[PDB]
Every structure is written in structure tokens, then in C-alpha cells.
Amino acid sequence: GPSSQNVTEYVVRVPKNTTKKYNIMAFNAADKVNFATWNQARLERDLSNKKIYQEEEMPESGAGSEFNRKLREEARRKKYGIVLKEFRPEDQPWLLRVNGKSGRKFKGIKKGGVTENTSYYIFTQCPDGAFEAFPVHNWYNFTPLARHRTLTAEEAEEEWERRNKVLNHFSIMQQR
Amino acid sequence: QEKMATNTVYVFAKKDSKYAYTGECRSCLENSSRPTSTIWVSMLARGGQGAKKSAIGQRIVATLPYIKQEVPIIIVFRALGFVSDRDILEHIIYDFEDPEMMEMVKPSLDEAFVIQEQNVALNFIGSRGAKPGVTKEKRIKYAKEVLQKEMLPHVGVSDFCETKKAYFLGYMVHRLLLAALGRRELDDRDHYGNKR
Amino acid sequence: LSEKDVDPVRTTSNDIVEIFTVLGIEAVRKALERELYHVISFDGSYVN
Amino acid sequence: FHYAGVSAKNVTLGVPRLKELINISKKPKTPSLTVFLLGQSARDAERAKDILCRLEHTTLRKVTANTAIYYDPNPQSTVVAEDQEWVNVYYEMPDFDVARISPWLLRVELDRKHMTDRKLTMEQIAEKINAGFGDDLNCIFNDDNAEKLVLRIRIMNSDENKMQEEEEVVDKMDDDVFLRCIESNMLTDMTL
Amino acid sequence: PILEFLEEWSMENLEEISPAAIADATKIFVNGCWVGIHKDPEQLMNTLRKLRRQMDIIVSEVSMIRDIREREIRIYTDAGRICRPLLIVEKQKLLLKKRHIDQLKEREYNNYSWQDLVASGVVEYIDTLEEETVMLAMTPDDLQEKEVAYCSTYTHCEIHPSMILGVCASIIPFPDHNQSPRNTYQSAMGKQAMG
Amino acid sequence: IWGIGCNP
Amino acid sequence: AERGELDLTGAKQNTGVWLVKVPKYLSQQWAKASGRGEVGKLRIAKTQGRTEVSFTLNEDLANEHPFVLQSVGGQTLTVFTESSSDKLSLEGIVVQRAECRPAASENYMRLKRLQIEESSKPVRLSQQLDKVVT
Amino acid sequence: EITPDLWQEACWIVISSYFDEKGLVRQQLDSFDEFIQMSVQRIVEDAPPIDLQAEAQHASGEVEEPPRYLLKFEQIYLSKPTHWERDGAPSPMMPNEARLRNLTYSAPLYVDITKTVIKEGEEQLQTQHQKT
Amino acid sequence: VGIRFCQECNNMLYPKEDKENRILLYACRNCDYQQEADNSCIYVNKITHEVDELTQIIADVSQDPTLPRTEDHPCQKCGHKEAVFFQSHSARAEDAMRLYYVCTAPHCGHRWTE
Ligand SMILES: [Zn+2]
Ligand SMILES: [Zn+2]
Structure with missing residues (x-):
């Protein structure tokens, strides 16, 4: 039939600007990602700066230095280090939470290696029958986090002190 | 002045050291700046005997720069963000079909089975770090900085290069495991290929 | 030396400390003389 | 470097040996011992071989071809096809079965070349293992006629029962981990 | 430039690599950084060597090493690597031919020099690491010519074996007829001579 | 320089 | 329905998309005008048991690009877009990967050398000065 | 065009070409040339720009009122070896004069520096200092 | 396992x-x-660790210039005469000087030990 010798040729279109930027979402094959159960999802910038960058300067900042003491306090903190960095969301990883808290959580990180000598484009079918190419603004590799009980850091330190766990570890996990 | 080559992985065997095989890599930031920082991946000898120690046998440890105490390797991989055991082994062992290498990796996985959180691993690295750590938040950020810059600089120093560092660390471990199995010969310090 | 069919009289170890713990100080005098004579005379050289 | 092959032994000579004797080092670089045979053992090479065997340290690891830890719920089940015959023979008149049978099994294959070179006996090895671990280990040994020498080891039947009403949920090493530790200890320090 | 070329020549980057695929492909290290893997190693190695011999993208000092048993290709652009020039052998025939030595012989008023020899691809610089992958012939005519088969795959040839000696040992006449410690002692004494 | 039993 | 919700309609429709790695000269030629709505034509010819993919450069643009396919079974890829209205959406799942390679072999190295020289222009070197500055 | 049994002449012709083009001490000279030509300039460019600002001077409203001074080094220049006399008149320094008079054979090193002043006056001025 | x-x-x-x-x-x-x-x-x-190195040998090693090659031992699979031959090249190989032959010629990739 015609399938054994079909020749398909389509026009290529590259619009100058698109309202929505195009990115790449890559999942590892072993993760067995399935979209049938993806009833809902939440993709947002991370807040890990809570732990290591911001609102960590909450209490000492609003303690209440004033007057000459205020001037000295601000100048002293600034000159002590090199002005702590705050939230600049566009340069931070992405957090994905599928089906709320019940479903799996993935973390996407921008591909550090830039494509100074390469570009990536995506071809999508359209009713007009011409391929459309959109540049890849960013590449993200998402990796899942198990929805299992997580050891507390303090408890983890206590357990690690007993590095020689002669007793079965599985029972220890059950106890936690 | 002759020096040992930088940005390369060399595996040696030291009899006196408790580690049966030690693999060292001295990394420089493309010779542009900073002193050369050496990161050692070592395998403890099976000579040490205990009910748990003999069962685990050889256990891999890593001497990260500016961390006083030896850190189990699985913990380092989790600190880079690869939490899952399968993914860590994917980086360390390139072909899962071979049983012997997986057997070598199993004890180190068991040693680090307590820590399953990236943040917890970072905190542990900071806590055992030589520089003092006041709080958990400070320790985590400090250890993250150490991993980002001090360890394996030539692979990357910024720009979210954790995957590259993970692959190169896994290569170091892969070479150490191959040396322990005997599939690759231990490197020779006198070879003038190594002596820039 | 205790094992059967091993000559207790002539069996000797090269370690002088073992000779001291097992056989005594005079035995070590003789054994140390023997070992030093061996190292000196291996090349054929002679010392009185 | 320039000794001779006549010695057929590692020998420290020259300046390093002089330093060892002078400093009276506790550990010589090459400790050595010359054994002179008393009587007929000196005359006959075979008797000398017997004395050699008596004087040379031999462990299970030297004579063991390979070790495998299996899980067999029923000894009669004989998960390994080969051991079916001798396990059935032993359990025709089972010993220590009344206490219990431990499900985890340690199976050790001994190289015949090494076994005959050191002139060890399967019954002898079984006795030594039984004495070393008391009744905590139960050993089953093949006949020498069998092409493959097999030694089957299980945890203590009394220990498997625990012989205790309370039973203690401590469950140290369960049984598999304990069996691995036993294997390592046997290989390293059997001193057959 | 080498990294750019490697990206052109079908080298998958580590970031884009599926972890399973690494096992069956060679790893490409440039200055000690694992850039990526290549599915077909020999074609890439030949292309890199061609580029170096034409001095297009890869400079002459850059050294490419392929460890066939370990599935690793290492390219070093680092400084401080010690290198010696060697003639190149294709098939069993030296690439250096009479036309080249005729041009060199009239080195004056022909502006043909060692750089022209390097650019022509007749000679190449080889460091020790690459020396481990190179079959060399001490003397061209003797070893290249067919005889009782020892090696039929010579890849490089020594320009002259006397160039192994240094500046002070080169003044020794008939060095091969002396005891080695005596050559070593003459190297020291020659520094202290008067002239 | 002679042999293994002699000198180097 | 919220700000962080991801429009998975593309996944539900199982829209298939193709990912291609293309060189900088082609992308820069496209970016030169980038507003004419046309850069070339993609021609795919299929035979009994073999398929070939090629791209022709537009004649105006120039003043053959064979495509090599890559297996996508080792990694699952999807494309998602962040709308300017803060409405994230999924366009489709990647079902095929391809690479675009230059046709010229040697003369293409000339253009590569020109690109290398252009990239080396910002590199600054120490300058020799004949007369000491007063 | 093979060279059979004429090899003794040919090998020494190619060796002579090597030694004519590249001297015996080429390694030291080439390394130093790389240092001066590339490494010095790269070290200058690699250094981070100097950022300076006042410590809340004048205790006023201080809405970023302290000026910001930014310095960026560029375009390093080297002169030929020069010896300045007691009179202060520059003059070229020949090597033998350096040996006889115990002088040091050195060359002046000059850098272009760009200084930008940001006083939050809505105007930034980028003065350039040439060959410092 | x-x-x-x-x-x-x-x-x-x-x-x-x-x-x-x-x-x-x-x-x-x-x-x-x-x-x-x-x-x-x-x-x-496996304490004996008597594992054949035939599986570990890579077919790519035939391309090595430095390896010796024999035309005396023909290939079993395809009959190609050339065959690079090399020793165990392995630590912890105990004491074996066996030659692990590898057939040359493209895509045969046959490894046999005699
Ligand atoms: Zn699970
Ligand atoms: Zn064949």
C-alpha cells in the first residue's frame, strides 16, 4: 500500500516570539513515570532558602537596633560577610508535587552545562500541517522523592553514633 | 619542578594505611586559580574483625577536603542530591549485570542506610566538618558550599554542576572497585605520564 | 619444639627475641653470635 | 637481590639484618625457623611431609572452593538437587531434629586438590568445626566417594527453638546475618 | 576548540546520557574532565589524529590516548607534558620521503623547516602516555622492512636513537661501548671542565 | 649488570 | 484549578513531539530574520524497510541537512511551557529524537575556524608597548 | 621516493632542521612567553572587580546615599626593559649593563583601569585611566 | 546472587x-x-574465584597496534587467520600465562583460549 512508499514533507515555521516559553521535562526511565494517575500537579519554585538563606535572618534582623546602634548594626552585619543573598527565584530549582501530598514529589534542576554551540527545537503537529520549531529555553531533569517516612535528623545522628547496628535495621525503621 | 599530574584519578595500595586501596584525585580549577584540592576515595581493609564489621567487610569511605572526619561514600552521593540507592549505584556501577561490583558496593550502602535525606546528609557532612558548626541551617549551607567549590573543582565549581560531580565521583569509585576486584592494575607513581 | 618427631636439641629460630623468651639469656648470647657471624661471613669476609 | 636460589626461602642478609640484630627489633622482617627432624621422619620424605603438614597453619579458607548461603525451609525439601541423597540418608535416622531445624543453610564446597594436599579428612574437619562452635553448628558431610565434597551447616536447633518461654524480641542478626558472621569467622580462624 | 569539535562529532554529553548507555561506550576525558561518551571510538580517534596532523583544530601539543581495554579516550591539552618528536609510519612505510629531505637540504632559500615537516604530517609529538599506545621502530629501514615477522603494525619510528641522551652525555664518544656508571660520571665531570 | 645472582 | 496547577491536557491527548539537535549556524540563520515565518522545508522519504529524514535550507536563507534518528526508549521526555499568564501547561511527550549534521566535511571546517576566530575576538592578550608611558 | 640506505644522511638532516628551528632552551623561553602574553592578562581579568561603598556616611536618610565605586582592570601592557637613572630619565637597559651594574632586568607593567562612580544621583560616570 | x-x-x-x-x-x-x-x-x-576471563575480554582489543598477532591459530567461528594474542593482563589472576586469543577482522569478535 501507500504506507510502504509514503513521502511526507511539511513547511517549517519559527515565530519570532511566543507568549509561553518552552522547556524540556526529562524523567528517568527506571522511575516508570505514568501520567494516567496525574489528576493534579503543583510546580513551583523551591523554598529551601528557608533552611539556608532567608527567614533564617528573621530574629536577629528584627531584634530592634536603633539610632547610632541601628547604623552600626546594619553596617557591621554587611561588612562582616558579603551581604547574604536573598530570594532570586528565576535562578532556583523547581519543585513538582503530583496529586498534592499524597502523590509523588519530583525535583527539577536546570541543566548546568549551557548549549553555547547547540540548540534544541520541538516539532508539534498542527492543523495547518506545517511543523513549528520552538527553542528550548531550559532543560530540567526531575527525580522523585519517595512518600515514605523520613528519619529525623536528630534521631539519625543518634543512630549513626551506633554505627555497629548488630540488631536488624528493618526493625529499627519500624520503631521510628 | 616535577609534580604529579592534576585532574586525574590514581589508585594506589598503601600497606600501612587502614585502607586496603586508596584512590586519589588532585583537582585544579583549569589552573586559573585556587590551590589544588585532593579528594581521596578509600576502601577500608577486611582485616578489621567484628560481628558487624566482618559481615560488611570492605566499606568505602571518602576523605573530602576540609572535612576532618572520613565520610561514607553513599552519604556523599545523597548529599549531592541522588537519594535513591538505585541511582547512586547507577552512577557508581555502569553495568548492573556484574554481581561482584554490586557486592562490593553493598556494605557501604548498609553503613549509610540511616541517612535517607539529602538535607540530613548535608548536615552530617557539616557536623563532621573541621570548621565549627553552630546550627543545623549553618552547617547545611556550609557543607553545600564545600561540595560546590572545594571538592572536585575541575568537574565544576558553580552552575548547578552536581550531576557532573556525581558522575566523576562515581568514576573514582568505579576505578577503586575495579582495582579491588583486580580487573585494573594499580597505577604507578613513577610513570612520567603522571609527572607533569 | 614440642611437636613429635622434631628434634628439640637442634631446632633453632633466627629471631633472637624468641630465643630469649624460650631458651634464656645465655642461649641468646650464642644465637646472637651465630646470626652476626652469618651476616659477616656471607660475603666471605672474616672478623676475629 | 643477589642471594641465590639455593636457599629457596626469603632471607634478610647484609646491612638490614645487621640493623635487626643490633637494634634487637621485636619483629624481624623475615622471621624464620629451621626445624631438624628427629628420626625416621628425616630419613623418609613422606614422613617429613607429615611433619610439614603438622607444622603449617591451615584454615578453612585455604581448602574451601566456594561458600553459598541458602534458605531451605525444610531439610527434606533439599533445595539443592545434589544434596538430596545424603540429606535423605542423614534424615532417615535424623539427629538433633527433635530440637528443631534451622531454615537458613550454609553450604561449603571444599577443593579436593587442597584437601588431599594437606591430607585433611572430611570427618576431621567436621569434628573440628563441631568442637569450635560446640552444638551451635550442625554439620553434614558427604562421603569421600562423592565427586563434589559438600559440607552443610545450619544454626543450632536448640538456638533455633531458643529453648526460652520469653523468646526475647531482640532477634540479634536474625539467622542469615549470624550465619554470614559464622562463615567469615570459620574461614578466617578455623585453624584446622 | 577540542570540546566544540567533540560536540560536533557525535559525542553525547554526560547530562543527556542515559545511565545504562555508558556501559557499552567509551568515555572521553578532556584535561581530566569526563566530557561525554562516544558510541564509535575508533572513527573519532582517527579523526582527531588527522586533525592534529593537519594542525587544523587540535594543536600539535595536544595528546590523544585511547585505552582499548578500559574503554576510555583521554585528551590532554595541559601544560608541562613532556613530548618528543617521532616519525610517522603508515602501513609499513615511513611517511618521510626523499622529496621532504630534498626540501630540507636546501633549507636556506626554500623556507622549509621543522614546522613544515610537522604541518605536512611527516612527524608528530608524542608524550609518554601516548607512548604507551604507540609501536615504535628503533631504526626505520631495519624494522619496517619485511623479515621474520615480529611486528607488522609499527605506527611510529624513532628519528635517531642517539637522541635519548642529554646535552652532557652527547659529548661522550662511543657511549655504547662504556660501562653505564662511567657515562654517568663523565656527565658530571664534563660540567666541571675548563674552556 | 651481569645477572640475577651477581651484581645489577 | 489553581495558579500552580499543570495543564496536563497535552498528556491526556498523548500529543507526540520530536526533539532535534541542530547546529549554531542553522539557528543563527533562522534568528537573522526570525520573523518571516519561514526558514526551510523538512522532507521525509520512507521506503519498504528504511526511512530517511532530510532538511532543505531556504534559498533566501542560504544567502542539504540529513537527520540521524536516536532511540528514545532509554529516557522518557516531555515538553512543558510556562505561559506569561502563569498558566503552566504540557505540550506533549517526546516520541523521537534526531540530530542535524552538516553536509560539507572539509570546507565546513573553514566556517568552524571562522566561528572559532569570532569567539576568540573577546579574548584579550598582553600588548607590547614600544615606548614607556610618561 | 622511499629513502633506503641513505637514511644516515636524512635523519641528521631532519634533526638539524629541528635544532635550527627550535633551540636547546626553547622550553624555558616558550613557557615565559606564554606567561607574559596570556597568563598575566588572564590573571588580571580573572580577578573580581573591586566594589567599594561608604559606611552610611553623614547619617542622613541614607537611601543608598553612600556612593558605590567600581574598579575593573583591563588590557595589560608591557614595555621593553627600561632603566631609570638618578635623574629620572628613562633609558633602555641593555643586558650587559645589568650584569655590570648589578641592575635587575625588568620591564614596566601597565594596566588600563576603569573607575565607575555611582552616587545614586541618577548619573554614573565611568572614567578610564590608561596604562597605569 | x-x-x-x-x-x-x-x-x-x-x-x-x-x-x-x-x-x-x-x-x-x-x-x-x-x-x-x-x-x-x-x-x-567463590574463594577459588575461577572465573573465565573470556567474558571480560573486549573484542575492541583486536585493533591495538601494540598487541602481537599470530596467523598460525585460525579463528574457530569464521576462519580468519589473524588473531591478536595476549595474556591474562589481570591482577589476582593467580599464576596463569594462558594466551587469550581474539580473532581480528571486523565484527567477528571471537575470543578463544587454547
Ligand atoms: Zn521499596
Ligand atoms: Zn573470526
């Missing part, structure tokens, strides 16, 4: 015995998934 990773958590499965059913179960400590073990072997250690 082989190590199996759980689907649910992508972590290593450790052996466990169900007392009620006397059935071996590979269960992760982190997650509750349990899997019946078909192999029924937990740990295997």
Missing part, C-alpha cells in the same frame, strides 16, 4: 523470612514492599 531494587522506593531489597509461611521475602527496610525470591540463594562467595 543479583541485587534487586524495589519498584516503590528504588532502594535495595534485603532478604527476610516470613515465619508464618516459611517463605523468603526480599523486603526493603525503607518501604513495606515485599517480594518472593525465586533464586532462594542469599550470598555466594
